[PDB]
Design a protein around this ligand. Structure first.
Ligand SMILES: [Cl-]
Length: 318
């Protein structure tokens, strides 16, 4: 049935498994080239007069939205969009499904229950505001917003949850309980897993992997609500293999295509297709208390710079 070239921005393992599973189902000779979302965006833009791939799969949706704005993508609404929550059906800036959401990374925190059992604390924290408990002094970690996008997602989430003023009040009250602002977004997951801290804040699928490997972690989607990142799929405008690109978007949005991502592809993000079985270490998306994250507003470089600078000035250095 021909061939398909994928620019993949997910992991190598997830990409390889998607290519193999797609090729098996549809008998399309499928290959991928893996690169980060930013590098991939630059490549697609550079190659726009003679595109070298058919589809862009995985990684954050925001750069795919920006490519849609620049006329680099081909709009196509898969019938499987019917199986995605209205909220996530057409999430990018230019409407018409130039891009679609294939998974979601949920911001939350996880608690080391063994270490909790040593702090004299009997109940597992279930809310963001539980983390200001003075019993948790020196027992929480989150990444440094200056060096980590994960921590910036936290800032933007709190700002959308409570307004910017109360978000920074919350950071001020959380601050005395933070033992380390880590350089990397994922470090609090490794540290909470090993008992180097009690609570780590970050993307829940990272804590899930530590739990999979045996760490005594309880994952929490905080009670007040929370934010997230989305994974995207998009067809390139001028794709050499447009028919097969549409089949691949169908597949990436399908029950089987999304299930295989965690069943064999080692991905632990929550799936956007509401008919899909979730990993036992992921979540039931329709039941989650999620803000509607405004990526257009908070993804702008000037707003991001401003909010990080405010965090530095008022939290880190005040
Ligand atoms: Cl099922």
């Amino acid at each position: 049935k021909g061939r398909l070239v994928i620019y993949c921005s997910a992991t190598n393992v997830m990409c390889e498994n998607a290519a193999k599973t797609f090729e098996q189902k549809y008998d399309v000779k499928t290959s991928f080239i893996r690169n980060g979302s930013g590098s991939t965006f630059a490549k697609i833009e550079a190659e726009k007069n003679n595109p070298q791939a058919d589809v862009w799969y995985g990684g954050t949706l925001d750069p795919q939205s920006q490519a849609g704005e620049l006329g680099l993508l081909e709009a196509y609404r898969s019938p499987n969009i019917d199986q995605i929550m209205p909220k996530f059906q057409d999430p990018a800036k230019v409407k018409g499904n130039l891009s679609s959401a294939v998974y979601i990374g949920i911001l939350g925190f996880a608690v080391n229950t063994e270490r909790l059992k040593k702090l004299g604390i009997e109940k597992i924290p279930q809310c963001w505001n539980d983390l200001t408990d003075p019993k948790l002094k020196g027992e929480i970690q989150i990444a440094d917003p200056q060096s980590s996008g994960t921590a910036y997602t936290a800032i933007a989430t709190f700002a959308q949850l409570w307004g910017e003023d109360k978000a920074f009040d919350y950071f001020k009250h959380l601050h005395p309980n933070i033992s380390q602002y880590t350089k990397s977004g994922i470090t609090p997951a490794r540290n909470a897993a090993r008992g180097e801290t009690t609570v780590g804040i970050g993307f829940l699928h990272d804590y899930a992997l530590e739990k999979e490997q045996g760490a005594p972690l309880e994952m929490v989607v905080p009670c007040e609500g929370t934010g997230y990142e989305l994974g995207g799929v998009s067809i390139l405008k001028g794709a050499r293999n447009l028919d097969n690109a549409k089949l691949f978007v169908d597949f990436a949005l399908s029950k089987e295509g999304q299930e295989t991502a965690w069943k064999k592809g080692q991905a632990l993000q929550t799936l956007t297709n509401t008919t899909a079985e979730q990993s036992p270490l992921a979540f039931d998306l329709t039941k989650l208390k999620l803000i509607d994250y405004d990526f257009e507003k908070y993804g702008a470089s000037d707003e991001r710079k401003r909010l990080i600078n405010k965090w530095v000035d008022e939290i880190k250095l005040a």
